[PDB]
């Protein structure tokens, strides 16, 4: 299916406060889609940003396995503890205000946990002709972004998701 929900029973409000606090120490990079890597390659020199990527040439996710160490004392660490799968290349993926990206097919589905969002942030599946909202309800949403799609944020606030990759 396009999307499925899995209850993590995470507190959206404590999760937000934890993310907002982390970005004050480790700010998002890029524009349009702003990013922070939450997993890094073993023994990485640039653990907070190496995993961040948006150029046309996508590289493999398999090496970004280490949840950063300073997360285990934060509520954001609790999200990783509750995951029912082993995540790879986890990133904060924040859509800027009034921003959307190209209609395209992604390489791989991802799980999205919306941290901050609004009714103006949607996924748009072109062939399925469905519009999908991911609420900041503390639960995990599988989104099949291999389907022809775009995402937009028509609001004036950043739409912040945590986006988890998986092998299996």
């Amino acid at each position: 299916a396009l999307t499925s929900r899995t209850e993590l029973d995470i507190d959206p409000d404590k999760l937000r406060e934890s993310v907002v606090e982390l970005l004050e120490r480790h700010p998002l990079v890029f524009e349009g889609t702003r990013q922070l890597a939450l997993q890094h390659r073993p023994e990485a020199t640039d653990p907070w940003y190496e995993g961040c990527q948006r150029q046309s040439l996508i590289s493999s996710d398999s090496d970004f396995t280490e949840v950063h160490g300073e997360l285990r004392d934060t509520y954001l660490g609790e999200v990783f503890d509750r995951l029912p799968f082993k995540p790879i290349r986890t990133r904060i993926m924040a859509l800027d205000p009034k921003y959307c990206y190209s209609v395209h097919r992604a390489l791989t589905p991802r799980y999205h946990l919306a941290v901050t969002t609004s009714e103006h942030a949607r996924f748009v599946f072109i062939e399925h002709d469905k519009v999908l909202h991911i609420p900041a309800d503390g639960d995990l949403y599988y989104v099949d972004t291999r389907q022809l799609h775009s995402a937009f944020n028509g609001g004036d606030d950043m739409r912040i998701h945590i986006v988890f990759g998986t092998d299996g």
Copy 2:
């Protein structure tokens, strides 16, 4: 329904080059949605832009009845001649690359003639759960933007529409 198409048999390439030459003598204003008024109130002193003002400044479209004189001997004036209705407050309305607007209900539904567009430009109707594309095929698309909707342009180029009002 959300949309309807009336055959106009405008030539897309001629309309496009007509619009490009107009715009380099009368530039678009604003960011995000960039605009130019093609109709003005009688005796308007700022006829190319008064019709572009935001809603809180405009009681209704009905006063903007006059097609600019310099349009009559161009291909654009031919477009006005072929419409099956009396147009009011017609504007060029260009959506910026990678831009979208909030999910809202528009005051007034309008007729769209796409000038330049791409597969990355769509209307999104939230309640109807439908995604619409308006092709640059020389025909006129009524779009009921009173419905809860957004629009987005995920391409690298501006999505240029001519947007016609009507009083019926």
